[PDB]
Design an enzyme around this catalytic site. Structure first.
Site, PDB file in Angstrom:
ATOM      1  N   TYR A 336       0.783  -1.232   0.000  1.00  0.00           N
ATOM      2  CA  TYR A 336       0.000   0.000   0.000  1.00  0.00           C
ATOM      3  C   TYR A 336       0.823   1.295   0.000  1.00  0.00           C
ATOM      4  CZ  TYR A 336      -2.470   4.004   1.690  1.00  0.00           C
ATOM      5  OH  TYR A 336      -2.954   5.287   1.800  1.00  0.00           O
ATOM      6  N   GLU A 370      -6.501   6.108   5.409  1.00  0.00           N
ATOM      7  CA  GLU A 370      -6.341   5.046   4.425  1.00  0.00           C
ATOM      8  C   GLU A 370      -5.571   3.818   4.876  1.00  0.00           C
ATOM      9  OE1 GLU A 370      -4.674   6.680   0.721  1.00  0.00           O
ATOM     10  OE2 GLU A 370      -6.264   5.433  -0.150  1.00  0.00           O
ATOM     11  N   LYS A 431       1.421  -0.196 -14.505  1.00  0.00           N
ATOM     12  CA  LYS A 431       0.294  -0.094 -13.582  1.00  0.00           C
ATOM     13  C   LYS A 431      -1.008   0.176 -14.333  1.00  0.00           C
ATOM     14  CE  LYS A 431      -1.527   2.147  -9.512  1.00  0.00           C
ATOM     15  NZ  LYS A 431      -2.117   0.845  -9.066  1.00  0.00           N
TER      16      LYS A 431
HETATM   17  N1  LIG Z   1      -7.414  -8.105  -4.455  1.00  0.00           N
HETATM   18  C1  LIG Z   1      -6.395  -7.966  -3.798  1.00  0.00           C
HETATM   19  N2  LIG Z   1      -5.593  -9.054  -3.401  1.00  0.00           N
HETATM   20  C2  LIG Z   1      -4.401  -8.993  -2.640  1.00  0.00           C
HETATM   21  N3  LIG Z   1      -3.906  -7.826  -2.212  1.00  0.00           N
HETATM   22  C3  LIG Z   1      -4.657  -6.664  -2.571  1.00  0.00           C
HETATM   23  C4  LIG Z   1      -5.867  -6.668  -3.335  1.00  0.00           C
HETATM   24  N4  LIG Z   1      -6.347  -5.365  -3.504  1.00  0.00           N
HETATM   25  C5  LIG Z   1      -5.472  -4.607  -2.875  1.00  0.00           C
HETATM   26  N5  LIG Z   1      -4.391  -5.283  -2.265  1.00  0.00           N
HETATM   27  C6  LIG Z   1      -3.243  -4.629  -1.482  1.00  0.00           C
HETATM   28  O1  LIG Z   1      -3.533  -3.235  -1.483  1.00  0.00           O
HETATM   29  C7  LIG Z   1      -2.541  -2.381  -2.122  1.00  0.00           C
HETATM   30  C8  LIG Z   1      -3.185  -1.392  -3.150  1.00  0.00           C
HETATM   31  O2  LIG Z   1      -2.736  -1.379  -4.269  1.00  0.00           O
HETATM   32  P1  LIG Z   1      -2.648  -1.321  -5.904  1.00  0.00           P
HETATM   33  O3  LIG Z   1      -4.048  -1.223  -6.532  1.00  0.00           O
HETATM   34  O4  LIG Z   1      -1.991   0.041  -6.079  1.00  0.00           O
HETATM   35  O5  LIG Z   1      -1.656  -2.709  -6.714  1.00  0.00           O
HETATM   36  P2  LIG Z   1      -0.077  -2.940  -6.228  1.00  0.00           P
HETATM   37  O6  LIG Z   1       0.088  -4.356  -5.836  1.00  0.00           O
HETATM   38  O7  LIG Z   1       0.220  -1.972  -5.161  1.00  0.00           O
HETATM   39  O8  LIG Z   1       0.853  -2.605  -7.473  1.00  0.00           O
HETATM   40  P3  LIG Z   1       0.420  -1.541  -8.564  1.00  0.00           P
HETATM   41  O9  LIG Z   1       0.034  -0.284  -7.821  1.00  0.00           O
HETATM   42  O10 LIG Z   1       1.547  -1.261  -9.489  1.00  0.00           O
HETATM   43  O11 LIG Z   1      -0.854  -2.090  -9.359  1.00  0.00           O
HETATM   44  C9  LIG Z   1      -1.439  -3.319  -2.635  1.00  0.00           C
HETATM   45  O12 LIG Z   1      -0.127  -2.954  -2.298  1.00  0.00           O
HETATM   46  C10 LIG Z   1      -1.907  -4.719  -2.193  1.00  0.00           C
HETATM   47  O13 LIG Z   1      -0.932  -5.295  -1.281  1.00  0.00           O
HETATM   48 MG   LIG Z   2      -2.499  -2.904  -8.270  1.00  0.00          MG
HETATM   49 MG   LIG Z   3       0.180   0.240  -5.501  1.00  0.00          MG
END
Ligand SMILES: Nc1ncnc2c1ncn2[C@@H]1O[C@H](COP(=O)(O)OP(=O)(O)OP(=O)(O)O)[C@@H](O)[C@H]1O
Ligand SMILES: [Mg+2]
Ligand SMILES: [Mg+2]
EC number: 6.3.3.4
Length: 485
Positions: A336, A370, A431
């Site tokens: 996050y 958040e 992303k």
């Molecule tokens: N469906 C899900 N399953 C597992 N972990 C999740 C899920 N939705 C959110 N998270 C957690 O919440 C955070 C919110 O993130 P996000 O949408 O930005 O994808 P990300 O893994 O952080 O990488 P990126 O931002 O590049 O897509 C993540 O770091 C993740 O660990």
């Molecule tokens: Mg993501």
């Molecule tokens: Mg992220």
């Protein structure tokens, strides 16, 4: 030693109280009150498997003094290194007390953690948050009494400039992030000091050094967050942020557990599986219906205590995932917040706008709650977020935009940093239902957003302002009642 000594608390300082009801799940333990009505009374909420002893500390330095801390501190070795000699503190609350004896309230300018703490020394009361206020702290102050809680709902039953009023509530204020409030109990007067602020200047470094510094900072922040002798759980989406975390945590613990959440309309299981095989983690996939997802609405507002629809709508999946976990209470690391300092939403090669949005985001995160731990502890799980670690955050925020948007890739320095620990696919990968149910309830769209705000606002009024458990809330009626307006 897997979970914090305490998750939160309701404390009261009287120069001269009913039992709390938290959203946080766990045991409640009232601390002793040796100075009677002239001490710090408090009810700690923690995991049933943990004695809350390290969450409380007492001393006689300066005055009779009692400290209560929710959460944990990460730069412990460093803080111990500045203390005068030898009998090391037993917990984080005692460490804080030692630090206060040397630096007074400036002790908080030194702490890199995930905590909220209240300390009473004599008729003086200090209220402090971590650098990002990742663990919300609220308070009610009046001449003679100060109540402090990690949950505003516990106070729901005098103005304070420098602190923001909690929507809906009356006389309840949220302590700013990266700050310490110094309150004279006798007069109810407070002076607030900021102990951290986002950097506004930017740093220049060649790729090599920039990539190494980012890898090292993240590795360190994750290591500080993993309990020795315990395999942590990482909520993994297969995105670079969470994957970056999983790779560090695996190296730190020697092995790793992961979990991915999906719905009946979408998921990222494929993307996550690539990382689980690469790291060889013990994986679990969870799919929850869209209908069940939206049902989380009252739970997310109740746990975050936010009235911003964009925040609530964003926290729904995570709330559902934490409540869907099966088995023992876990220590969870997430990816996050990485997008904020790194301009994850930036889609162009033109750099100017990346810094504009970045500066604005860093100037407006406080109050959104958040990454509040209540999101997961409502199901008894503890979450920590390595990208918002103070050292990692400072680093990422400081890097010149050209290192965040480089070679046509977003968040380039982080991808490069994890290039040797994850599949190329994961490193190169660049992303709403809530709108829907509203649209299906006779609500045209210019209005749909304001409707989400009215829906959220209402849930908050019932769950946080009123005193109703999310389960006792019929979300459909709330949506309807608003839709017909
Ligand atoms: N469906 C899900 N399953 C597992 N972990 C999740 C899920 N939705 C959110 N998270 C957690 O919440 C955070 C919110 O993130 P996000 O949408 O930005 O994808 P990300 O893994 O952080 O990488 P990126 O931002 O590049 O897509 C993540 O770091 C993740 O660990
Ligand atoms: Mg993501
Ligand atoms: Mg992220």
């Amino acid at each position: 030693p897997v979970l914090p000594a305490a998750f939160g608390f309701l404390a009261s300082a009287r120069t001269g109280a009913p039992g709390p009801v938290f959203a946080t799940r766990g045991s409640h333990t009232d601390i002793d009150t040796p100075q009677g009505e002239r001490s710090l009374a408090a009810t700690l909420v923690h995991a049933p498997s943990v004695a809350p002893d390290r969450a409380v500390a007492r001393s006689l330095t300066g005055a009779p003094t009692t400290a209560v801390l929710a959460g944990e501190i990460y730069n412990r070795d460093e803080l111990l290194s500045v203390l005068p000699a030898g009998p090391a503190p037993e917990g984080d609350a005692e460490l804080v007390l030692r630090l206060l004896e040397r630096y007074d309230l400036h002790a908080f300018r030194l702490v890199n953690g995930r905590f909220a703490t209240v300390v009473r020394t004599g008729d003086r009361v200090l209220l402090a948050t971590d650098h990002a206020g990742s663990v919300p702290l609220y308070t009610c102050v009046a001449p003679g009494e100060v109540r402090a809680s990690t949950e505003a709902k516990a106070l729901a039953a005098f103005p304070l400039a420098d602190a923001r009023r909690v929507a809906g509530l009356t006389g309840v204020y949220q302590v700013p992030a990266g700050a310490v409030m110094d309150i004279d109990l006798g007069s109810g007067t407070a002076v607030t000091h900021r102990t951290w602020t986002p950097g506004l200047s930017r740093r220049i470094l060649p790729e090599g050094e920039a990539v190494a510094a980012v890898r090292a900072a993240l590795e360190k922040a994750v290591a500080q967050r993993v309990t020795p002798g315990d395999t942590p759980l990482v909520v993994l989406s297969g995105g670079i942020d969470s994957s970056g975390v999983a790779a560090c945590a695996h190296r730190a613990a020697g092995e790793l557990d992961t979990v991915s959440m999906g719905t009946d309309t979408s998921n990222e299981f494929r993307e996550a599986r690539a990382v689980v095989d690469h790291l060889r983690t013990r994986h679990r996939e969870i799919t929850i219906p869209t209908t069940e997802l939206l049902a989380q609405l009252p739970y997310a507002v109740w746990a975050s205590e936010s009235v911003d629809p964009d925040i609530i709508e964003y926290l729904l999946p995570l709330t559902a995932l934490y409540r869907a976990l099966d088995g023992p209470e876990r220590r969870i690391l997430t990816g996050y917040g990485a997008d904020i300092p790194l301009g994850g939403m930036h889609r162009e090669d033109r750099l100017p706008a990346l810094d504009t949005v970045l500066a604005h985001d860093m100037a407006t995160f406080d109050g959104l709650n958040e990454m509040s731990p209540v999101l997961s502890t409502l199901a008894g799980h503890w979450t920590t977020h390595p990208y918002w670690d103070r050292e990692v955050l400072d680093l990422l925020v400081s890097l010149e935009a050209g290192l965040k948007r480089r070679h046509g890739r977003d968040k380039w320095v982080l991808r490069a940093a994890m290039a040797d620990a994850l599949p190329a696919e994961t490193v190169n990968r660049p992303k709403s239902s809530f709108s829907r149910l509203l649209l299906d309830h006779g609500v045209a769209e210019d209005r749909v957003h304001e409707a989400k705000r009215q829906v959220v606002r209402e849930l908050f009024d019932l769950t946080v302002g009123g005193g109703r458990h999310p389960s006792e809330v019929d979300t459909d009626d709330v949506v309807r009642s608003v839709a017909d307006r």
